Design a protein around this ligand. Structure first.
Ligand SMILES: [Zn+2]
Ligand SMILES: [Zn+2]
Lengths: 156, 98, 44, 85
RNA sequence: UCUUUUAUUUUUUCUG
């Protein structure tokens, strides 16, 4: 009994055995009286990632599996005789927000700015010349249209 | 497209069955008067890439040693017809039954 | 005016669902001109 | 859907802020919606610790044809005490 | 009548 199990990439047991066996008819047609000592090759759907080849000598199997891509010939194990009948058993299984506005009596006079948030009685505006937010009452500030021009107090 | 024979287990294209039938079981099939389509099935598992009938001990188990080198499935689902089961008493079910 | 070109420096005034290709040239960086908004900045 | 805290009034109809307008803190500069099978905005707000003026904006198409945008923001840094020289 | 986001890791850069 010389049945050796070999690792290979899972999901392609069908295709790897196909390539091996087609190669084997090609070889057996090619050679003359002497023809290579491989007895059987097979696999199982339940046991993926592996094939099982029955052959007499390691160099015969290596010589046979040269030229076959993806087969991991470097991992082979000689399956013990006792494990074979079980392996081969036939039966397995607001409007002020966001608007442009100017200040008119404060240290920041003439500063344009944009209304961001209002907390009641006081509005926060970001200076259009400096990087700062300042809080100041709305009734004392003048609101304009989107575009520069006519100016109106807090009465919109 | 692939179909598996239910008696000897030879697996191959339905086309090649339609041309050449079953090379191993041609005589029995003709004697029983049953076409290869009924005695083959499409459902099979456990392939065998089969080379040495007279020397493969796997083949000695699977009852393929008297057949040609080829393409054999360890399981082929289905029940073989009585008109060949009676005429091949040495056969056993290939699905693991019996 | 909405958008302008890079090389030709020509206006396009395009809208959405339109290719960003310029008409005068195939060059299509497609800069966007300054906003119409009046801008205040103080020397501070 | 989930919009950012940035103010969306500054953004134009195309969804892109034009140069010459301030963007400060978390103010949005690019208006993005990412539909999948409701608008589900995915915009890129401005940095909280950064303030300045949108200097330039460029719209192009990548190799895949998808729209690409690059927005340059300019600010002035005057020396302060903590500045290193 | 409030709530309300800012991926992760691999690298590199420098700062004391
Ligand atoms: Zn048969
Ligand atoms: Zn142009």
């Amino acid at each position: 009994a010389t049945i050796w199990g070999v690792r290979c990439r899972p999901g392609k047991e069908k295709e790897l055995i196909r390539k091996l066996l087609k190669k084997k008819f090609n070889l057996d047609r090619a050679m003359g009286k002497k023809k290579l000592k491989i007895l059987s090759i097979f696999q199982r759907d339940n046991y993926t990632g592996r094939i099982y080849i029955e052959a007499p000598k390691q160099s015969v199997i290596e010589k046979f599996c040269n030229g076959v891509p993806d087969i991991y010939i470097s991992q082979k194990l000689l399956i013990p005789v006792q494990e074979l009948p079980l392996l081969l058993k036939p039966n397995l299984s607001e409007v002020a927000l966001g608007k442009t506005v100017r200040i008119r009596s404060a240290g920041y006079k003439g500063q344009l700015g944009i209304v961001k948030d209002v907390n009641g009685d006081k509005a926060t505006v970001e200076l259009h010349s400096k990087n700062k937010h300042i809080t100041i009452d709305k009734h004392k500030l003048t609101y304009y249209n989107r575009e520069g021009g006519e100016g109106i107090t807090y009465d919109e | 497209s692939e179909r598996a024979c239910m008696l000897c287990g030879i697996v191959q294209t339905t086309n090649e069955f339609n041309r050449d039938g079953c090379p191993n079981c041609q005589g029995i099939f003709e004697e029983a008067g049953v076409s290869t389509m009924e005695c083959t099935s499409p459902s099979f598992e456990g392939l065998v890439g089969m080379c040495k009938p007279t020397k493969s001990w796997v083949a000695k188990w699977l009852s393929v040693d008297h057949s040609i080198a080829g393409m054999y499935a360890i399981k082929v689902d289905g029940r073989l017809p009585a008109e060949v089961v009676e005429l091949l008493p040495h056969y056993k079910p290939r699905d693991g039954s019996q | 005016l909405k958008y302008i070109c890079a090389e030709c420096s020509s206006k396009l005034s395009l809208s959405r669902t339109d290719a960003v290709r310029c008409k005068d040239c195939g060059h299509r960086i497609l800069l966007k001109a300054r906003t119409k908004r009046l801008v205040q900045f103080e020397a501070r | 859907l989930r919009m950012k805290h940035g103010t969306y009034d500054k953004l134009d109809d195309d969804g892109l802020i034009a140069p010459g307008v301030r963007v400060s803190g978390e103010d949005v500069i690019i208006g993005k919606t990412t539909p999948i099978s409701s608008k589900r905005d995915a915009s890129t707000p401005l940095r909280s610790t950064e303030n300045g003026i949108v200097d330039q904006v460029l719209v192009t198409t990548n190799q895949d044809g998808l729209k690409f945008v690059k927005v340059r923001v300019r600010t002035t840094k005057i020396p302060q005490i903590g500045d290193k020289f």
